[PDB]
Symmetry: C4
Subunit: 91 residues, 4 copies
């Protein structure tokens, strides 16, 4: 579960990284950064896609990727750190 969501999240971010570095000309790390802050809804106050292709892709990317990214964040917190921390809480 967490493993599949992990993999699925990675592929989604790879796709965004490739798209923005190619169509929007960002350095790969910047493309990955943009993909991450966009899908987590944090957003970026400096960059917004400048091409129409980039704007359309971003719209579709958000709708398809937000669900997956938060499910991963959900399981990551509830199934990977909840107990880990909740562990020591046990005297």
């Amino acid at each position: 579960e967490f493993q599949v969501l992990f993999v699925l999240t990675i592929l989604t971010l790879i796709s965004g990284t490739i798209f923005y570095s190619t169509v929007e000309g960002l350095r790969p790390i910047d493309a990955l950064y943009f993909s991450v802050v966009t899908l987590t809804t944090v957003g970026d106050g400096n960059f917004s896609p400048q091409t129409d292709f980039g704007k359309i892709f971003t719209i579709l990317y958000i709708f398809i990727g937000i669900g997956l990214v938060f499910g991963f964040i959900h399981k990551l917190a509830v199934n990977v750190q909840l107990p880990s921390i909740l562990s020591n809480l046990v005297p």
Copy 2:
């Protein structure tokens, strides 16, 4: 369900597209982009409504549209891609 949420989301985005292209003077694609990033809470780091009418509309738009947009994203992920991916997971 997913079909109705799909339609309802489309109409909401059409309304935003028309509003921002008219009152804020954005190109239609930019108006649609702004509507999408606003309702998904991603936001835009470049554009903010410049007119008071645009600011008031945006406030109301957010309150009325956030719920619908996320419900759609919710069902879209839980009822359209959960199984699709979860399908192959079956050996």
Copy 3:
């Protein structure tokens, strides 16, 4: 319920409107706009508090107001438009 959340949301936004117009010097409508996009997490790509008092207030404001604002958005969609739309869906 929806009425109390409505009132509670209004008071929270009034407080933000007064704070930002006074300490950050925004026009009241801009102060209200900032308060709304901050508590809904949409954010603004143009304005960020410039004073330390404004930064500290914003931090506390977010933590205390996000919960209330989304609960309101939650009930507003689930208890005010779900049926309204779901109504006609009935042949």
Copy 4:
């Protein structure tokens, strides 16, 4: 519970404050502000990490911290202000 989430949220914000003031050179209050708006997804329309180290840290920081911060906001609203307000509601 609320006490542990409170503590856990504080440590996460302290880590971000130290990181951004050091690597990105922000004043401590600005580093704390950035950490808060990033983890709550509000975002900042002015600042984005300028170094690759800052971009990578921010990506990891978001994934690990969003879950905790919202759980805290969740319990804070549902277990600390729900009754407090809901209290007087009792005639």
